Amino acid sequence: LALSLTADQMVSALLDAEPPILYSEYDFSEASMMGLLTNLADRELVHMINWAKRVPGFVDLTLHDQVHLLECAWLEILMIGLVWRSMEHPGKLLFAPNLLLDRNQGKCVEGMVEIFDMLLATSSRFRMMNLQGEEFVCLKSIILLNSGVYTFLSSTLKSLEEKDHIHRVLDKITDTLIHLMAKAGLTLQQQHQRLAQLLLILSHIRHMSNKGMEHLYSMKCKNVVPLYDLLLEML
Template structure:
């Protein structure tokens, strides 16, 4: 089972004309094709006015309802921002920095698994299927969140936790400069596109449900 990502677009647009005697036909208002249909209705009896146009909400309303449902589900288990408890009194070294990062990722992974269960359709999968999706994309999801938290720094530093901000020179110390440069680039693109929290949640869900196309080697 996967998240539905589209709705049927629109109903057919109907233009109708009404005429009386020698008068010119009056043009009716059109309803939006992707969200409404149009029907004629009039009251019975002499002297009644011209038919009125009734707009019936269809695709657009359902699409908004579906989007709201998905966002509400994702926000119920939004990933928290955890402290790293990094010991800043210890001299910086590759081992010390990586040790902090690994411990932080272990704790974040617990919340990530709980969050995934709120993605519509995820728990319909077998247990092995759920595990497979998490295995395929957990690091990508954690780094995506790091990129989002780092937007205010415009690619100059990465915010792994409120107490664990890493400047560029520390990326080399950790031996992770190549991958962290990519995370920084993603963060800069988020700034450029003014990515919102709601968009981040939907992007996370998209990554999760598409993870099976990138099998672990």
């Protein structure tokens, strides 16, 4: 299974799991903008499910746990992927090949400019660090597995083994990240520094997800179960 994979074997697995890139429904008040984004998120979300299944180790976990991971990670994963796509588009966000939005077009939705700025800062940092695809894909898997691991129900011998498994795979991806960096020619010190630099960014992506989530939660009718909830429901 996933624990005996080599670093090359893991990068491959991860690159192959990558889901196709989605298009938007076509390029401006609050409702029209939130509709595009909401539509794109939901389709990305449906793709995210079969991606997660292709991630080494994810499928060894019980369903309710798989679902908990996605519940906790889905907006982060959407965001890192956006930030990655927007890397070579300074001051802009590439939601889709046909939806490239301005810093300013965030102002279309009271609340969203704060969030656009954070995404722009994140992708700017990735550009400075010259983040690579092999690393991007690794980060994305770390988010999937780490964002929900501290919030299970650890009262049980089975939730212990679940946590233990996830942490073992997380170690394997760390091993993989270092492996990529050693191959790229960085020194030990540079390796350790880049590892840290990248994992600290994951803290900011968490922050952004929390904020996006809080904004989502305050915009919606409270009598409404949003589509992310339902999908994880029917799972």
